[PDB]
Amino acid sequence: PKSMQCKVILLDGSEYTCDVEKRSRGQVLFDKVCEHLNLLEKDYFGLTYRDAENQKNWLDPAKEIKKQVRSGAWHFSFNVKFYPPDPAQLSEDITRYYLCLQLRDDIVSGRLPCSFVTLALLGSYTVQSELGDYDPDECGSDYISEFRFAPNHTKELEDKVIELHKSHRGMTPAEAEMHFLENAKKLSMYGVDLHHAKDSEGVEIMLGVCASGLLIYRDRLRINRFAWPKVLKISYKRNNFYIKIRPGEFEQFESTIGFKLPNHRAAKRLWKVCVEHHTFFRLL
Ligand SMILES: CC(C)Nc1cccnc1
């Protein structure tokens, strides 16, 4: 039996290495990673890889790894796939912990935009979780944390993190992580997967996929939202992505909204994340 080496970037930035038989399906590698992480609530998570166009793709657990990575390295990242709308209802603290690590990267990366005060507040809960109670011994008037809190750091942000950290004395790691999540879950881009597209007129838009449904970001003024129950059919053909929008009470016909994606693979990728979100969030 021939085995391929797999490298997985974990959410703390460390690398997990293992071997799987070369015809293994994605579920095999994912089960190895989740066992390493002591993770039981695995349904919210997945592995991504980069394709030959350098696009992030979800590794499909049902399909052979080799038929997905194709010509690329067997290099993966461990990620949140389905962001829980109510992290308080997850059964395990360790689930909440990995969700916090993902969100910290969503924030530092700029995928999850955040006000100054919310960057500082989230930062303060991370520090409380990671270091425990505030200690002035480690932190003088010139303190800069090793923790990344934002896409751009300022001394004012570091100071506000410390001020709010002082307020969390006695807070345990699980408690700080729950506070982090109660705040992060409210952010307008929480758990929103953005795809670049053009509308039927050629105007550049972003399509957001999340728990609540499909979002169309046009220009600051005019954001369309289609709740999953309002979506009967998701389709792709060539470079085009289509959603079937329910008639609404006393209308005779379903209505159709069409988008142009950069290429056929981008349209298929958007279709698959929409179908997976619709299934997941129709059962939640
Ligand atoms: C399917 C996910 C992992 N990758 C992605 C998300 C948004 C836009 N393009 C690619």
**Residue 193, ligand 1, Cβ within 6 A:** yes
CB of 48 closer than 8 Å to CB of 117? no
**Burial code of 225-251, b = ≥16 C-beta within 10 A, e = fewer?**
ebebeebeebebeebbbebebeeeeee
Amino acid letter, 48: T
In testing the pocket of ligand 1, which one of 56, 109, 259, 275 has its CB within 8 Å of the most ligand atoms?
A: 56
Residues facing residue 48 across a β-bridge: 58, 77
Q: Rounded to an integer, what distance in angstroms lies between the CA atom of residue 263 and that of residue 133?
A: 51
Looking at ligand 1, which atom is closest to the CA of residue 46? 3
Looking at ligand 1, which atom is closest to the CA of residue 273? 1
Looking at ligand 1, which atom is closest to the CA of residue 48? 3
Token pair recorded at residue 18: 């293992």
Residue 224's H or E segment, with its range, is: strand 223-227
Token pair recorded at residue 228: 């999953």
Sheet holding 255-260, edge to edge: 223-227, 213-217, 204-209, 193-199, 255-260, 240-245, 231-237
Q: Rounded to an integer, what distance in angstroms lies between the CA atom of residue 13 and that of residue 4?
A: 22
Q: Three-state SS for 139?
A: coil
Q: Rounded to an integer, what distance in angstroms lies between the CA atom of residue 108 and that of residue 119?
A: 10
Phi, psi of 146 (to 5 degrees): -75, -25
**Residue 269, ligand 1, Cβ within 6 A:** yes
Resolution in A: 1.7
CB of 105 closer than 8 Å to CB of 10? no
Residue nearest to atom 4 of ligand 1 (CA): 56
48 CA to middle of ligand 1, Å? 9
Q: Rounded to an integer, what distance in angstroms lies between the CA atom of residue 62 and that of residue 282?
A: 21
Token pair recorded at residue 135: 């200690």
Q: Rounded to an integer, what distance in angstroms lies between the CA atom of residue 245 and that of residue 234?
A: 9
Distances (CA, A) of 96 to 85, 91, 99, 222, 270: 12, 9, 5, 34, 27
Q: What is the CA radius of gyration of the chain?
A: 21
Q: Rounded to an integer, what distance in angstroms lies between the CA atom of residue 107 and that of residue 100?
A: 10
Dihedral over Cα of 208, 213, 216, 222: its sign: negative
45, HSE (Cβ side, Cα atoms, 13 Å):
30
Residues facing residue 168 across a β-bridge: none
What is the CB neighbour count within 10 angstroms for residue 17? 8
Angle, CA of 83, 50 and 24, to the nearest 5°? 85
Tokens 């795809």 locate to: 195
Supply the DSSP symbol for 42: G
**Residue 208, ligand 1, Cβ within 6 A:** no
Amino acid letter, 242: Y
In testing the pocket of ligand 1, which one of 193, 215, 276 has its CB within 8 Å of the most ligand atoms?
A: 193
Token pair recorded at residue 80: 């949140």
Residue nearest to atom 1 of ligand 1 (CA): 57
Tokens 């992480």 locate to: 37
Burial class (CB in 10 A: 0-12, 13-18, 19+), 14: exposed
Residue 177, sorted as left (phi over 0), alpha (psi -120 to 50) or beta, turns out to be: alpha
CB of 48 closer than 8 Å to CB of 42? no
Strand residues in 22-135 grouped as ranges (E): 45-50, 56-58, 75-80
Q: Rounded to an integer, what distance in angstroms lies between the CA atom of residue 147 and that of residue 203?
A: 39
Dihedral over Cα of 11, 13, 18, 19: its sign: positive
Residue 245's H or E segment, with its range, is: strand 240-245
Token pair recorded at residue 164: 């709010």
Q: Rounded to an integer, what distance in angstroms lies between the CA atom of residue 192 and that of residue 79?
A: 14
Q: Rounded to an integer, what distance in angstroms lies between the CA atom of residue 44 and that of residue 70?
A: 25
Say how many Å lie between the first and final Cα of the chain, rounded: 40
Tokens 């699980």 locate to: 174
Distances (CA, A) of 188 to 14, 96, 215, 257: 29, 20, 11, 23
**Residue 57, ligand 1, Cβ within 6 A:** yes
Q: Rounded to an integer, what distance in angstroms lies between the CA atom of residue 99 and that of residue 230?
A: 28
Residue 198's H or E segment, with its range, is: strand 193-199
Closest CA to 214 of 275, 255, 266: 275
Closest CA to 54 of 232, 212, 266: 266
Closest CA to 193 of 52, 42, 82: 82
168 CA to middle of ligand 1, Å? 36
Closest CA to 207 of 147, 271, 156: 271
Tokens 């916090």 locate to: 100
- The method recorded for this entry reads X-ray
